Structures are given as structure tokens and as C-alpha cells.
Design an enzyme around this catalytic site. Structure first.
Site, short mmCIF file in Angstrom:
data_model
loop_
_atom_site.label_atom_id
_atom_site.label_comp_id
_atom_site.label_asym_id
_atom_site.label_seq_id
_atom_site.Cartn_x
_atom_site.Cartn_y
_atom_site.Cartn_z
N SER A 122 25.74 -43.35 -47.26
CA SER A 122 25.31 -44.16 -48.25
C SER A 122 23.41 -43.94 -47.70
O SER A 122 22.59 -45.03 -48.42
CB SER A 122 25.50 -45.70 -47.12
N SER A 172 24.55 -52.44 -49.50
CA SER A 172 24.95 -50.58 -49.84
C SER A 172 25.42 -50.85 -50.99
O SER A 172 27.10 -50.75 -51.04
CB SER A 172 25.19 -50.47 -48.18
N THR A 219 21.78 -47.24 -42.72
CA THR A 219 23.04 -46.96 -42.97
C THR A 219 24.20 -46.18 -43.39
O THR A 219 23.99 -45.55 -44.62
CB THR A 219 24.47 -48.43 -41.97
N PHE A 235 28.62 -43.94 -43.71
CA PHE A 235 30.01 -43.85 -43.33
C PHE A 235 31.26 -43.02 -44.36
O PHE A 235 30.93 -44.09 -45.45
CB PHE A 235 30.66 -45.59 -42.96
N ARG A 238 27.62 -45.71 -34.67
CA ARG A 238 26.48 -45.36 -35.00
C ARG A 238 25.02 -46.32 -34.86
O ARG A 238 24.08 -45.54 -35.21
CB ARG A 238 26.74 -45.07 -36.34
C1 LIG Z 1 27.62 -45.63 -47.56
O1 LIG Z 1 27.38 -45.07 -46.51
N1 LIG Z 1 28.66 -46.47 -47.70
C2 LIG Z 1 28.91 -48.17 -48.84
C3 LIG Z 1 28.88 -48.71 -47.48
N2 LIG Z 1 27.57 -48.63 -46.94
O2 LIG Z 1 27.40 -49.71 -45.69
S1 LIG Z 1 26.81 -49.25 -44.56
O3 LIG Z 1 25.98 -48.28 -44.23
O4 LIG Z 1 27.23 -49.65 -42.79
O5 LIG Z 1 27.98 -48.22 -43.56
C4 LIG Z 1 30.18 -49.12 -47.04
C5 LIG Z 1 30.54 -47.29 -46.73
C6 LIG Z 1 30.57 -46.61 -47.50
C7 LIG Z 1 30.73 -46.37 -48.66
N3 LIG Z 1 32.82 -46.76 -48.55
O6 LIG Z 1 30.68 -45.53 -49.71
NA NA Z 2 26.77 -50.44 -37.95
#
Ligand SMILES: *C(=O)N1C[C@H](NOS(=O)(=O)O)CC[C@H]1C(N)=O
Ligand code: NA
Length: 247
Positions: free
Chosen positions: A49, A97, A188, A190, A232
């Protein structure tokens, strides 16, 4: 970046949580950065993300995103997280996100323009293979913590190959903590829990303004259980509190 210097005093925040990861912190500029792990600082990982930062800039530059008041309308069809099932502004989509908003941006940008801008931005390995709507989620794109801080420094200084107004628009969308004495912009990510013997990655990247100074930061860690995800933010926050930067 100029030089990268090892700071062993930060290892304690990782070992206490049994985390394999890296923090990169640069005062004033990427001329001199510090890290707990020289090798991992330059190791490249899926952006997940954190890719919303360049993707938003590219969306604005290409006109796919009209301006900062554009509303990305929800069509009422299922999305993978309930917090994404609503109309969103650019800042809203970044803060929750909302992957599907950014997937459609990427589709409209297209492969040719996306490749061009990642080259202009020197963004990681610049490898967009794997599908225009998922290369940063499960494809071949990789970026290191060092490269993240170089990219964020350019954004801070309005030196990316994009209009100043578009860089300002994305920066506003990235504010995550405001205090009279300091301001944090951050994002962030993940990638997931990975697979057997092949962990996912979690990220927190951004910068802090305090007094007349600026600190650029990037954290990543290996992760195979989502219960560990708050580390994180908590590990780098503890480091930056210990350094007197935030708090
Ligand atoms: C980004 O990494 N993604 C979208 C969403 N991001 O939220 S986070 O920045 O708090 O981790 C969820 C996790 C991830 C994804 N599932 O694609
Ligand atoms: Na967090």
C-alpha cells in the site's frame, strides 16, 4: 543518498519483539542516513500500500484523478474490506487504503504511462510486470527502505517530475499526525502473511517536521502473522521518540 551509517542502539527495539526488520532515518536530507542494518536498508521488497503515494501522483499528473476534490464513487458492489465500501475522497482513499480505487487509477493510467513515471521517480526496481492492477500487490515491483526515503525527500521538496500543486495535493492526503510542534506525513503497507518459509512484508514510511528540521523515515519488517502488524508503527515510533523527534 550519501552514506548509510549503522546505529546498533536501535537493535534492542527489534530483538525485544523478535522482529526481523529495518529502520532507516535521515535528518535534513538523504545525504546521511542511519539504520540498524546496512544490508537490509538496501534490500528491496514489495511496496504494497505504500505504492499509493506514487500512484496518486501519477493519477493526478495524467489527469485520471481530476483534482483533490474528486470523489471516487462506490458502485455498491462488494469490496474486500468493509471500510472501502463508501464514496471516498483522495485523502479518504489513502487513509482507509482502498485498494480498488487505486487499482482503477492504475488501469486508466495504463502500462506505458505507469512505466514512464516510475522511471522518472526512480521508484525501486521499476518492474511493473504482473498485471497493471496488481504489480505492487503480488507482482515483481520491489523497493528498499533507502529508496523510499529518497523518493519521499523528493516529494517533500517538490522535486519529483510532477507539478508542485499535485505534489502538494498528495502531501495533504498523507498527513497522519498534527501537533503544534511537529507534523507527520506517512503511509502504511502490508503485503500479507506470505507463504511457508517466505514471509510477507509490513511497512511504515514518511517524514516528520519538527522545529525547522525534517526527518525522513522508512521501516519494514518480515511478517507471517497479522497480530504482529502494529509493530510496524510501534518499533519506529519508539526509536523516533528515543531520538527526540516525536512524543
Ligand atoms: C496495503 O498494503 N494494503 C491495503 C490495506 N492497507 O491498509 S494498511 O496500510 O493499514 O496495511 C490493507 C492491507 C494491504 C492489502 N490487503 O492490500
Ligand atoms: Na498499524
Amino acid at each position: 543518498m550519501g552514506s548509510i551509517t549503522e546505529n546498533t542502539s536501535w537493535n534492542k527495539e527489534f530483538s525485544a519483539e523478535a522482529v526481523n526488520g529495518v529502520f532507516v532515518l535521515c535528518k535534513s536530507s538523504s545525504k546521511s542516513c542511519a539504520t540498524n542494518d546496512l544490508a537490509r536498508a538496501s534490500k528491496e521488497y514489495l511496496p504494497a500500500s505504500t505504492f499509493k503515494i506514487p500512484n496518486a501522483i501519477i493519477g493526478l499528473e495524467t489527469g485520471v484523478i481530476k483534482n483533490e476534490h474528486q470523489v471516487f464513487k462506490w458502485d455498491g458492489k462488494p469490496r474486500a474490506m468493509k471500510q472501502w465500501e463508501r464514496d471516498l475522497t483522495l485523502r479518504g482513499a489513502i487513509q482507509v487504503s482502498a485498494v480498488p480505487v487505486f487499482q482503477q487509477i492504475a488501469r486508466e493510467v495504463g502500462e506505458v504511462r505507469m512505466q514512464k513515471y516510475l522511471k522518472k521517480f526512480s521508484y525501486g526496481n521499476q518492474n511493473i510486470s504482473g498485471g497493471i492492477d496488481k504489480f505492487w500487490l503480488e507482482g515483481q515491483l520491489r523497493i528498499s527502505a533507502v529508496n523510499q526515503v529518497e523518493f519521499l525527500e523528493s516529494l517533500y521538496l517538490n522535486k519529483l517530475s510532477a507539478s508542485k500543486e499535485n505534489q502538494l495535493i498528495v502531501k495533504e492526503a498523507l498527513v497522519t499526525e498534527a501537533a503544534p510542534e511537529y507534523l507527520v506525513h506517512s503511509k502504511t503497507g502490508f503485503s500479507g502473511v506470505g507463504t511457508e518459509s517466505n514471509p510477507g512484508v509490513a511497512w511504515w514510511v514518511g517524514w516528520v517536521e519538527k522545529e525547522t528540521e525534517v526527518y525522513f523515515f522508512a521501516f519494514n519488517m518480515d511478517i507471517d502473522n497479522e497480530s504482529k502488524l502494529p509493530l510496524r508503527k510501534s518499533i519506529p515510533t519508539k526509536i523516533m521518540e528515543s531520538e527526540g523527534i516525536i512524543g
